[PDB]
Amino acid sequence: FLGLTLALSKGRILEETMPLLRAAGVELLEDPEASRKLIFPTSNPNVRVLILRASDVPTYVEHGAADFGVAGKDVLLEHGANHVYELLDLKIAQCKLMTAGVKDAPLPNRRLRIATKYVNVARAYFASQGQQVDVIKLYGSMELAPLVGLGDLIVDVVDTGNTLRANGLEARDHICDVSSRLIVNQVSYKRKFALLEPILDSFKNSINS
Amino acid sequence: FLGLTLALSKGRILEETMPLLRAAGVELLEDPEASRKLIFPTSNPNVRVLILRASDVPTYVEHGAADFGVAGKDVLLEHGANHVYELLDLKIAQCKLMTAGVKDAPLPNRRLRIATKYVNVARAYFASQGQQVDVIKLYGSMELAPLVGLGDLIVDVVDTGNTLRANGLEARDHICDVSSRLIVNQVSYKRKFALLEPILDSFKNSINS
Numbered sequence A, B: 001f002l003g004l005t006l007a008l009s010k011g012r013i014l015e016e017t018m019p020l021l022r023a024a025g026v027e028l029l030e031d032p033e034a035s036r037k038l039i040f041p042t043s044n045p046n047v048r049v050l051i052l053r054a055s056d057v058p059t060y061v062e063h064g065a066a067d068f069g070v071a072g073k074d075v076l077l078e079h080g081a082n083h084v085y086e087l088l089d090l091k092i093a094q095c096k097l098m099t100a101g102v103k104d105a106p107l108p109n110r111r112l113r114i115a116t117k118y119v120n121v122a123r124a125y126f127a128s129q130g131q132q133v134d135v136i137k138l139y140g141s142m143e144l145a146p147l148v149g150l151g152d153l154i155v156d157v158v159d160t161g162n163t164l165r166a167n168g169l170e171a172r173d174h175i176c177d178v179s180s181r182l183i184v185n186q187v188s189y190k191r192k193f194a195l196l197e198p199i200l201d202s203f204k205n206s207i208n209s
């Protein structure tokens, strides 16, 4: 495939990216949410879309299996963004990385154990608080961990806070704001700039309003 | 909670475990597939169920956040089973760990790159073939990886083989057979044996027929 391959993920990233794509002249020809297919043509024959797990977007873009992609800052921080270029903050799929635990549970006076998917972000954040923590790696449902006593806190993304509230948890610390970012393969940026440029300019214009 | 906490995962593990549980006198009181809730009472007041991501079952059981659980051999091999006891092969959710690639694609004469979730299993398998491979860690949709040239092969579970066939891929090597296994926390095994024992005996009896 000679053109550009764009990496997206299902849910909020797909939904909130599509209007940027539309204004940039790119529209999907069916709903990826309703297909098991993974590669999708678009209204532009030079652009195709990969639908990936959010955690795999940086990986595909880094290796050049996608030329560019839309990834959450949370995923970028966790994966490491040293081998892609972060070109734009798209200001979509906004949320916060936070620490949380059982409401009014006292913290134990010992090395804390942090149940989380975000092991690198947990370690770096807690290091900034003077804290060398243990991490317990999980793949999902962080909110259960404090209810069964797995770790002392979690680190997870919080949007409305409804998940935390539904489970008797409250945010302890705000780590950072998260939004989806446009990332580009370091070589594709150089080799396919004439294809990327009008799309980047459109996105940038769109984000201003 | 004084009783036993059982870790399960959604889909085939939940579906195929429920009959064993029923024969052991444990029935869920609603369908976990239709709830966002994670802890579930059962017909037995001494048994509750956690619904977890399959990859987190060994973790919860290891730490004692669950006393026992049902995990796929694939997950156990990848996570490491050195800090739980594998008590039974339940013979449910049967599948195979396999290597696969694009159909009739020749392997490149260099260090292979293996796109997979199963990074430890990929490295150990290929080591047995005299091969020190690079791994590219992914979280899902392994079948896409060879279609976009991310890695040379994948390692993933194969059941019917329909996923591979739908994507123009074929299995190259059979790594091992996979089935769901009953695992127990090493301390719970010792402290809660009188609760576990009749349930284990029931499962063992059930698996014989």
Ligand SMILES: O=P(O)(O)OC[C@H]1O[C@H](OP(=O)(O)OP(=O)(O)O)[C@H](O)[C@@H]1O
Residues within 6 Å of the ligand: A156, A157, A158, A159, A160, A161, A162, A163, A164
């Ligand atoms: O603060 P809230 O508005 O309750 O949202 C927080 C949830 O969002 C994230 O999940 P993600 O968005 O990846 O998928 P989900 O919302 O479908 O769980 C995260 O894992 C929390 O479960």
Ligand SMILES: O=P(O)(O)OC[C@H]1O[C@H](OP(=O)(O)OP(=O)(O)O)[C@H](O)[C@@H]1O
Residues within 6 Å of the ligand: B156, B157, B158, B159, B160, B161, B162, B163, B164
């Ligand atoms: O050989 P097949 O019968 O096509 O099945 C193989 C699929 O099964 C596994 O997924 P899992 O069972 O975890 O969930 P899924 O089947 O819903 O993808 C694996 O990740 C493959 O995608």
